Amino acid sequence: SPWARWFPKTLPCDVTLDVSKNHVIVDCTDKHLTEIPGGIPTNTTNLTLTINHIPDISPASFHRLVHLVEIDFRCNCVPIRLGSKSNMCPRRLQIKPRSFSGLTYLKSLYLDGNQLLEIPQGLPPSLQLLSLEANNIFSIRKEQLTELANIEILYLGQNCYYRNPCYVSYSIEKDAFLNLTKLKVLSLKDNNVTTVPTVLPSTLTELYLYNNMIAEIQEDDFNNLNQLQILDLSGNCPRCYNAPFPCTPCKNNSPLQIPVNAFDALTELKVLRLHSNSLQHVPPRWFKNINNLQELDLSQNFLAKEIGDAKFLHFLPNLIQLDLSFNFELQVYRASMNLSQAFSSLKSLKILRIRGYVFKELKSFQLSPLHNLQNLEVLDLGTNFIKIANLSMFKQFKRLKVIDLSVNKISPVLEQLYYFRYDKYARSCRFKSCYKYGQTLDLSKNSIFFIKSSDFQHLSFLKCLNLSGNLISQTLNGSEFQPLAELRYLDFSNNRLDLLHSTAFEELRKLEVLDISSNSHYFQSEGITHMLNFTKNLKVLQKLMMNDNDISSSTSRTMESESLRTLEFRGNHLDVLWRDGDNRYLQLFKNLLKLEELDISKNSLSFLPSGVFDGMPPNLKNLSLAKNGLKSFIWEKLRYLKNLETLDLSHNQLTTVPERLSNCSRSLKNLILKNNQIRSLTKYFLQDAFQLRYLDLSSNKIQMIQKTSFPENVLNNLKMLLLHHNRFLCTCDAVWFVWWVQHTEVTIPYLATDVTCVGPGAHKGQSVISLDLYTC
Amino acid sequence: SPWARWFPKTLPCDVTLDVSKNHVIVDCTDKHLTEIPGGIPTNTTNLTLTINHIPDISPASFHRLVHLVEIDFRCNCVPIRLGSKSNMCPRRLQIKPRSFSGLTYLKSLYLDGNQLLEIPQGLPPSLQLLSLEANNIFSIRKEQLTELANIEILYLGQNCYYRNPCYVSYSIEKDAFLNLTKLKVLSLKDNNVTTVPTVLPSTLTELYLYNNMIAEIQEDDFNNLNQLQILDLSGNCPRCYNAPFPCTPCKNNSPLQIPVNAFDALTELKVLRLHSNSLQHVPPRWFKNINNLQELDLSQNFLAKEIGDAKFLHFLPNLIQLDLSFNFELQVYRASMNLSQAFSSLKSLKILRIRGYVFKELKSFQLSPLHNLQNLEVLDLGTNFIKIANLSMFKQFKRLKVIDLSVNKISPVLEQLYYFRYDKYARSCRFKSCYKYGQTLDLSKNSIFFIKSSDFQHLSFLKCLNLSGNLISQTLNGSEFQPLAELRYLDFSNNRLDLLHSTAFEELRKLEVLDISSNSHYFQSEGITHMLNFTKNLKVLQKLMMNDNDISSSTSRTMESESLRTLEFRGNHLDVLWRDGDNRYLQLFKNLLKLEELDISKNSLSFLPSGVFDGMPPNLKNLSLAKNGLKSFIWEKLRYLKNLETLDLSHNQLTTVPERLSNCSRSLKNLILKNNQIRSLTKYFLQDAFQLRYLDLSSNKIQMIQKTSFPENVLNNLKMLLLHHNRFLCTCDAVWFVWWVQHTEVTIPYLATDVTCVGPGAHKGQSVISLDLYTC
RNA sequence: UUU
RNA sequence: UUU
Ligand SMILES: *[C@@H]1O[C@H](CO)[C@@H](O[C@@H]2O[C@H](CO)[C@@H](O)[C@H](O)[C@H]2NC(C)=O)[C@H](O)[C@H]1NC(C)=O
Ligand SMILES: *[C@@H]1O[C@H](CO)[C@@H](O[C@@H]2O[C@H](CO)[C@@H](O)[C@H](O)[C@H]2NC(C)=O)[C@H](O)[C@H]1NC(C)=O
Ligand SMILES: *[C@@H]1O[C@H](CO)[C@@H](O[C@@H]2O[C@H](CO)[C@@H](O)[C@H](O)[C@H]2NC(C)=O)[C@H](O)[C@H]1NC(C)=O
Ligand SMILES: Nc1nc2c(ncn2[C@@H]2O[C@H](CO)[C@@H](O)[C@H]2O)c(=O)[nH]1
Ligand SMILES: Nc1nc2c(ncn2[C@@H]2O[C@H](CO)[C@@H](O)[C@H]2O)c(=O)[nH]1
Ligand SMILES: *[C@@H]1O[C@H](CO)[C@@H](O)[C@H](O)[C@H]1NC(C)=O
Ligand SMILES: *[C@@H]1O[C@H](CO)[C@@H](O)[C@H](O)[C@H]1NC(C)=O
Ligand SMILES: *[C@@H]1O[C@H](CO)[C@@H](O)[C@H](O)[C@H]1NC(C)=O
Ligand SMILES: *[C@@H]1O[C@H](CO)[C@@H](O)[C@H](O)[C@H]1NC(C)=O
Ligand SMILES: *[C@@H]1O[C@H](CO)[C@@H](O)[C@H](O)[C@H]1NC(C)=O
Ligand SMILES: *[C@@H]1O[C@H](CO)[C@@H](O)[C@H](O)[C@H]1NC(C)=O
Ligand SMILES: *[C@@H]1O[C@H](CO)[C@@H](O)[C@H](O)[C@H]1NC(C)=O
Ligand SMILES: *[C@@H]1O[C@H](CO)[C@@H](O)[C@H](O)[C@H]1NC(C)=O
Ligand SMILES: *[C@@H]1O[C@H](CO)[C@@H](O)[C@H](O)[C@H]1NC(C)=O
Ligand SMILES: [Ca+2]
């Protein structure tokens, strides 16, 4: 950070630099500002003020800031229902005239979420991007668009919908956008639009008309858009069954009415989204002149019958992605899957998703139309309530990256809300997985209670198997997964593993990662034999996760591995296994010879009995003891951890630091003490601690730091030093620290905002960075 | 509390009165004391000082306190391993001489957990009870027992064991206790005792010799104890398999050796505990002269074979309780249960526990020896890894109160640690269920994935069924429980209920309480139809618990009941169902016409949209909105809840109270605002709020309270007012409050200890009750 | 802070 | 705090 020494440390904003674009970026996101801060550098190019309470903008706002290419002034007055009900914006944002017209270089302007009533005027002709989402602008008129000749990108959505209502239909003047001769992207989503606006500039590449009241498309509506690549008409005549938002369908179960010739102009179309349009038929004719369609979304329609027919697919040999999820006929539970022969035409297909078709049995041959699709990578059949499926059918799908049968009822990545989101592409005010192991079979959240070898016959190619969230209550003995000779990752979390036998999992001879987290069930009942020593047999295991198992007893006293590097053991009861006076489990982790990372956070350890560190394995580097309620800690015992580099002690009740950190651990690089009860440092704390790089003392109760505790020869090595949310006393005794804080180049986050005096007197609440201690 | 106005409010101890015994009880438990407090009333009879740091006792300690009948001075210096590792006691408690000899009326003295080295001398002859547990007294000599002639009760345990070791065998002089001619109870547990001390006073009623190194009983050892009622020899030659403490068995798997005539003197014996004695045989001869034995514990032995034989039981026709739990042969999994014919002799038997026998199949006829035990109430067969059991066999057990099959592997109240506790009867430093509905079948924590009517065929008598913690993933439709016509309580928690059908549970026509908590599984996946309106059909349902289900969607918009009085709905996502601008679920609870208690805590409600309170059902009395992260609350809306009496708003972020509580809710009796961010009250807050009785403002950030906020005509009605852990400013502006706090008789808990100034100056940390504001 |  |  030598380039940053020119800028003031008092600025409550994060400053960064894109060298080679000569951009100075300044980020004042969510800093509780009522004024643009004075201090913003003259050379600032990208300025972000989103999530603040600046009530107006004037020519004074940006007078000095002549180099601005981008202003992000979003969410300073968000509509009532979109916003905080504690911090309700009293009055819309006021933009006085001539506020932007002076910015010759302004390429991007964001004014979303400010309750604006009309399109801001006075905008410079250099402007390429204008964003006005989540305002109250519901009438577009040619008169208002006169200064936007150079505009390429226009975002006008979310100005009239259930969360920001305008109480009328959206109005666009005939030809409103036609004279914007460089317009590439236009978004009119979530707006109560009733007809496609015409005529649109032929230069458009992307048009978003989704979530509106458009009941019909005219054959003329997209006539001239011969450069269009993305069209989204989704959510016009929506499918409302289980919608998690208020939802009015078109009268009489009617689909969005699209004439057969309506897409004929669209020769460049790559992407077509017709999600939630209540479609019953997909006429093949639609696609006659679209030869390069790559992505097609037909989810949330009523296309169950069509999936069995689907003549349209013969016209899509370059399609990469096809989504037909959630097309089930209400109240019907089909016996089986009827996939059309036509799916065999989809020669370029990489991703097929057919969630929510809703059927009882998947027979091997019902996916045969896909067997010869050479490029198919993902087949998603989740959320189908499938009860029966012979998994061996996926031998015909070795070439796939992912076979997803998540959320079904089988017995012997996309975001969680996705197909049922109102607008999954919506912008927040804040901003603008084992697949890498190879072939993956995802059986998570099914009803598998018992597994046996024969279940995985013909699946020896699998690299990752996800059995998370089944019902498996079995004493695994090393015979259940015998065919999975190539398996590298197994997720067995959220089952009810019964570790009676130490031969469990031994047959997975290439296993690298095993997750048996959240199998607490048998660990919670007394008198049950549990063998934690099963690790010995897994000869290439690197990572073992056994979190949230409530482990408080083990019949074996040692875990052993020649290979394991990482062990997550959080949310167990090491406090019970290491009860004071009981030596038996002090060497629990000692024979994990290659162990470098150990997480024993959330284990309810008020104290560590002696023996614990001596019993750690010799290569331990990363140790977490976070969130244990620790109240004391013999720092001297760190001498036993000769390779320790990171010690996470956050979120405990430690009241002291070691007298001499260098006499405790020569190797220690990162020490994390945040959220403890430390009231003072020790006199020579960091002395001679040359190896230290990172030190978090944030969220403690520290009053004073003196120079002897914090020698410069150490501090100037620190990559980072965190000191915020402490109880700093700002008397003349604190003068070294106050001065040092003001002048050091050591990185201290939240320095301007949250390193604050608690006293005395009128110093309360005042940043230490701004403090003038002229009498000391 | 008029009797209590005589005692000082500054006393950091709870004072109470047993009228009619003329006892004044004073409790200073855990108040961080280094001195006995001055202020303890002269008439104090029972004084408790446990869990403090008083380093010595002298004649000054109790000079004034001449009426003391009981001193509880435990745990002022607990042994290192038993105690806090943060607050380690530096030095044993010092008892200077003549400290007790002046107390003519002292009947009970507790000095446990003070690292004492010898038995305290100078004790008054009125003493009936002396307790010295958890000290370092490991040699008993007749010389030391000279002042104890009147002693009835002596507790000497926990002076030499794995958590407080003495490093030698315990020593008792021959005849040590013989001359204590009134000794009734003697406890030598947890002491490294190697032989039964002889000869013991014949007046003994209870003798606790458990958890020791006693390998043999001599035929003479209990010769003269013809009044003995309780004998505990447990844990001498322990069974160590899966012991959760360090455990050395007697050499060569050897049992505790008890001669066949060893109990012949014990004609009064009611209770015999032989838990964890590695017994292989129970010779019938032991019980020849014990005709009134009521309770017998033979758990944690090696009696699996003996349970199939068991001739000793013919000699126990008055036995009420028999425990044979955890007798399995290591490494053996029996095909079935072999119960001896002899169990049919147990004519008085009420409770039989046979956990941990460990067998695969329970056939109907294998319990036939119990069929004609007329008084049998509890049959406990938990933790047996039973895989098969025809539940209809319990038609032969209609008369039982509880049939417990908890923790087995069946596919189509004791504390948690109990049989594996080191000492389940141990004293803490601090102190010294659906069964009521009728017949209960507990199938919790089994492997039941599917249920059907025929499973419950001859079980129509059941009143309570616990299916908690099975694997049930089924769409219940009202046919699965048809035979359970008399069922009143069903616990279906920790399954995976799939509420597709609104007919679920309708067949349980007499159902009063239904628990479907922790069935979150299908609620977490989008697009799944869920019918919360199933409540309509259950015509006598009183209480419905549906906690921690993560509910964020429902196909139905209303829950309906003519009968339901309590609904627990905590740990769901009402925030999503009541998203601002979505009206559809604002009447979710409206048609629960008789609903009086609603818990919607932990539902992630930053705010309540309007409509919520209007949509509450008309008889709502008890509402919890705790732990929601609420940041604002329109108090005026409480007008809609015309019968509200309790409002729990604890653990939120509210920053204000209503301007006028009486203009918000005339009916409100208990208002709970603890753990919020309230900084000041409103000027007339409680004015005219005559109906208020309970008000918790603890753990806020309150600086000042003025008289206008807190009128006396309201306050003097308050049963309780909580004000602790606030941020009180102690200036002259606070004078009304400081004075009022000092003189009111309103109950304010923690007044002496935790109502404290934060400022200004040297007032910091000082109790407001002690504050002298003489200049105001 | 005798479990 | 546009989900
Ligand atoms: C600073 O603002 C400029 C102008 O809005 C951003 O420029 C974009 O940069 C990306 C890649 O970095 C290009 O693909 C876009 O074409 C540019 N947009 C325009 C309108 O010119 C720049 O990225 C911003 N930088 C930061 C770090 O926020
Ligand atoms: C979308 O526009 C419609 C009409 O095109 C709005 O509906 C009108 O709203 C007012 C106030 O609720 C009613 O008095 C009228 O009856 C409605 N008219 C019709 C024809 O429905 C609607 O509010 C707009 N939607 C949003 C979300 O703003
Ligand atoms: C109970 O007494 C035994 C012996 O009676 C103690 O064992 C001795 O302990 C010390 C230190 O562990 C050894 O050096 C001795 O050699 C042991 N002697 C024998 C005879 O075993 C034991 O420590 C005592 N137990 C407790 C818990 O205090
Ligand atoms: N944990 C477990 N133990 C079993 C089972 N079946 C028999 N056992 C035996 O039960 C005892 C306690 O777990 C041990 O002796 C086991 O060998 C089972 O399914 N799970
Ligand atoms: N919740 C649930 N829905 C099912 C099941 N089988 C079919 N469905 C159908 O799937 C859709 C979503 O639940 C509804 O139309 C249901 O009728 C099942 O086992 N559970
Ligand atoms: C599925 O297709 C088969 C023939 O391949 C046919 O018998 C059946 O009617 C189809 N099912 C439905 C529900 O349309
Ligand atoms: C499942 O299919 C495979 C052929 O891929 C066959 O080996 C196996 O026997 C089938 N099992 C069942 C239960 O249908
Ligand atoms: C297994 O499935 C669950 C989704 O049901 C998911 O949370 C988990 O991440 C998956 N595992 C892996 C390794 O991706
Ligand atoms: C209270 O103590 C006094 C002084 O020792 C005694 O005279 C008086 O009788 C006691 N009161 C009662 C009710 O015992
Ligand atoms: C259980 O008793 C039967 C006879 O009723 C006997 O044949 C069987 O072997 C017994 N089992 C064992 C393990 O002793
Ligand atoms: C269980 O026993 C009952 C007799 O009480 C009988 O009705 C039934 O056939 C048995 N059920 C099974 C599944 O064996
Ligand atoms: C059901 O059993 C579990 C023990 O697994 C217990 O938590 C629960 O309290 C029992 N339910 C009732 C109503 O007693
Ligand atoms: C469940 O469905 C209906 C109840 O409405 C019933 O007639 C049917 O027989 C039931 N079937 C099963 C298999 O539970
Ligand atoms: C539950 O709601 C659904 C539709 O929302 C309706 O079909 C059904 O009749 C309702 N059932 C009851 C018992 O109220
Ligand atoms: Ca200055």
Q: A528 CA distance to ligand 4 centroid (A)? A: 6
CA distance B157 to B75: 14
Interface contact A606, partner B, CB < 8 A: yes
Q: B166 CA distance to ligand 3 centroid (A)? A: 8
CA distance A156 to A162: 16
Q: How many helices (H) and strands (E) does chain A have?
A: 5, 39
Nearest-by-Cβ selection for B473 from A447, A527, A576:
A447
Q: Give SS3 for A660.
A: coil
From atom 2 of ligand 11, which residue's Cα is the shortest distance away?
Answer: B392
Q: Is B409 annotated as a binding residue?
A: yes
How far lies A770's CA from each of A161, A710, A738, A746, A766, in Å? 46, 21, 9, 17, 8
Q: Is A409 annotated as a binding residue?
A: yes
* HEC assignment per residue over A62-131: CCCCCCCCEEECCCCCCCCCCCCCCCCCCCCCEECCCCCCCCCCCCEEECCCCCCCCCCCCCCCCCCEEE
- Of the candidates A28, A90, A101, A105, the one whose C-alpha atom is nearest the C-alpha of residue A58 is A101
CA distance B696 to B747: 12
- Tell me if B626 sits within 8 A of B648, measured CB to CB: yes
Tokens 């409050």 sit at which residue? B737
Which B residues 56-75 have CB within 7 Å of strand C?
Answer: 74-75
Backbone angles phi and psi of B15, in degrees to 5: -110, 140
A423 CB inside 7 Å of strand D = yes
Tell me which residues of chain A, numbers 656 to 695, contact chain B at a CB-CB cutoff of 8 Å: none
* HEC assignment per residue over B602-623: CCCCCCCCCCCCCCCCCCCCEE
CB atoms inside a 10 Å sphere around CB A88 = 11
From atom 7 of ligand 4, which residue's Cα is the shortest distance away?
Answer: B333
Q: Is the CB of B498 under 6 A from ligand 5?
A: yes
A419 CB inside 7 Å of strand D = no
Per DSSP, B420 falls in state: S
- Our CA angle for A769, A771, A772, nearest 5°, is 135
Tokens 């979420």 sit at which residue? A113
- Decide if B607 and A409 are in contact by the 8 Å CB cutoff: no
Interface contact A418, partner B, CB < 8 A: yes
Q: Which two tokens stand for residue B41?
A: 């009333």
Q: B466 CA distance to ligand 12 centroid (A)? A: 6
- Decide if A445 and B521 are in contact by the 8 Å CB cutoff: yes
Which residue has the least CA–C1' distance to nucleotide C1?
B83
Q: Is the CB of A18 under 6 A from ligand 1?
A: yes
CATH code of the domain containing A684:
3.80.10.10
- DSSP symbols for A592-611: ETT--EEE--SS--S---TT
Which ligand gives the minimal distance to the CA of B20? 9
B25-47 CB burial, b ≥16 within 10 A, e <16: bbbbbebebeebbeebbebbbbb
B425 CB inside 7 Å of strand C = no
Residue A60 burial (10 A CB sphere; 0-12, 13-18, 19+): exposed
How far lies B352's CA from each of A481, A597, B355, in Å? 42, 49, 10
A114 CB inside 7 Å of strand D = no
Q: Is B747 annotated as a binding residue?
A: no
CA–C1' gap, B190 and C3, in angstroms: 13
- DSSP symbols for A283-300: -GGGGTT-----EEE--S
CA–C1' gap, B69 and C3, in angstroms: 28
- Tell me if B213 sits within 8 A of B237, measured CB to CB: no
- Decide if B526 and A471 are in contact by the 8 Å CB cutoff: no
CB atoms inside a 10 Å sphere around CB B251 = 8
Q: Is the CB of B494 under 6 A from ligand 12?
A: no
Q: Which two tokens stand for residue B433?
A: 């269920």
- DSSP symbols for B234-302: TTSS---TT-SS---PPGGGPPPB--TTTTTT-TT--EEE-TTS--S---GGGGTT-----EEE--SSS
A426 CB inside 7 Å of strand D = yes
B86 vs A contacts (CB less than 8 Å)? 606-607, 631-632, 653
How far lies A372's CA from each of A344, A660, B237, in Å? 7, 68, 71
- Tell me if A495 sits within 8 A of A472, measured CB to CB: yes
A632-664 CB burial, b ≥16 within 10 A, e <16: bbebebbebbeebbbbbbbbbbbbbbbebbbbb
B411 vs A contacts (CB less than 8 Å)? 449
Q: Which two tokens stand for residue A539?
A: 């000869």
Q: Is the CB of B104 under 6 A from ligand 11?
A: no
Q: Is A385 annotated as a binding residue?
A: yes
Q: For residue A155, give the nucleotide whose C1' atom is nearest its CA.
A: D2
Length of chain B: 776
Q: Give SS3 for A735.
A: helix
Residues of the domain holding B612:
1-776
CA distance B237 to B260: 18
A110 CB inside 7 Å of strand D = yes
Tokens 């394991």 sit at which residue? A564
B235 CB inside 7 Å of strand C = no
- Our CA angle for A338, A341, A343, nearest 5°, is 90
- Of the candidates B4, B50, B37, the one whose C-alpha atom is nearest the C-alpha of residue B432 is B50
- Tell me if A473 sits within 8 A of A495, measured CB to CB: yes
Q: Which two tokens stand for residue A36?
A: 């643009």
Q: Give SS3 for A312.
A: helix
- Tell me if A425 sits within 8 A of A398, measured CB to CB: no
Per DSSP, B742 falls in state: H
Query: What nucleotides of chain D have any atom within 7 angstroms of a protein Cβ?
Result: 1-3
A87 CB inside 7 Å of strand D = yes
Domains in chain A: how many in total? Answer: 1
Interface contact B328, partner A, CB < 8 A: no
- Of the candidates B516, B469, B520, the one whose C-alpha atom is nearest the C-alpha of residue B490 is B516
CA–C1' gap, B639 and D1, in angstroms: 30
Task: State this model's resolution in angstroms.
Answer: 2.5
Q: Give SS3 for B524.
A: helix
CA distance B319 to A330: 63
B134 CB inside 7 Å of strand C = yes
Q: Is the CB of B426 under 6 A from ligand 5?
A: no
End-to-end CA distance of chain A: 30
Q: Which amino acid is at B431?
A: F
- Tell me if A27 sits within 8 A of A64, measured CB to CB: no
Q: Give SS3 for A736.
A: helix
Q: For residue A134, give the nucleotide whose C1' atom is nearest its CA.
A: D2
- Decide if A526 and B163 are in contact by the 8 Å CB cutoff: no
CA distance B542 to B619: 14
- Give residues with Cβ within 8 angstroms of B253, minimum separation 6: B278, B302
Mutate to test the pocket of ligand 12, among B401, B465, B468, B568 (most ligand atoms within 8 A of CB): B468
Q: Which two tokens stand for residue B270?
A: 């009611």
Mutate to test the pocket of ligand 5, among A327, A358, A407, A445 (most ligand atoms within 8 A of CB): A358
- Give residues with Cβ within 8 angstroms of A677, minimum separation 6: A653, A654, A655, A700, A701
How far lies B739's CA from each of B687, B761, B764, in Å? 20, 20, 18
Strand bridging mode A321-323 / A295-297: parallel
From atom 11 of ligand 10, which residue's Cα is the shortest distance away?
Answer: B338
- Of the candidates A375, A520, A538, A391, the one whose C-alpha atom is nearest the C-alpha of residue A459 is A391
Partners of residue A388 on adjacent β-strands: A361
Q: Which amino acid is at A616?
A: M
Interface contact A331, partner B, CB < 8 A: no
- Nearest-Cα distance to chain A for B245, in Å, is 7
Residue of chain B whose alpha carbon sits nearest to that of A330: B529
CA distance B169 to B195: 10
- Tell me if A50 sits within 8 A of A87, measured CB to CB: no
- DSSP symbols for A219-272: TTTTTT-TT--EEE-TTSS---TT-SS---PPGGGPPPB--TTTTTT-TT--EE
CA distance B569 to B38: 49
Q: Which amino acid is at B516?
A: I
Kindly list the strands in the beta sheet with B388-389, ordered across the sheet, starting from the edge strand earlier in the chain: B334-336, B359-362, B388-389
Residue B493 burial (10 A CB sphere; 0-12, 13-18, 19+): buried
Q: For residue A131, give the nucleotide whose C1' atom is nearest its CA.
A: D2
Partners of residue A322 on adjacent β-strands: A296, A352
Residue B760 preceded by cis peptide, ω within 30: yes
Q: A612 CA distance to ligand 12 centroid (A)? A: 36
Backbone angles phi and psi of B284, in degrees to 5: -55, -30
How far lies B724's CA from each of B626, B693, B696, B751, B752, in Å? 19, 18, 9, 7, 10
A305-342 CB burial, b ≥16 within 10 A, e <16: ebbeebebbebbeebbbbbbbbbbeeeeebeebebbeb
Tell me which residues of chain A, numbers 120 to 179, contact chain B at a CB-CB cutoff of 8 Å: 162-163, 165
- Give residues with Cβ within 8 angstroms of B19, minimum separation 6: none
- Nearest-Cα distance to chain B for A581, in Å, is 5
- Nearest-Cα distance to chain B for A80, in Å, is 9
Strand bridging mode A23-27 / A14-18: antiparallel
Helix (H) / strand (E) element for B741: namely helix B735-743
Q: Is A772 annotated as a binding residue?
A: yes
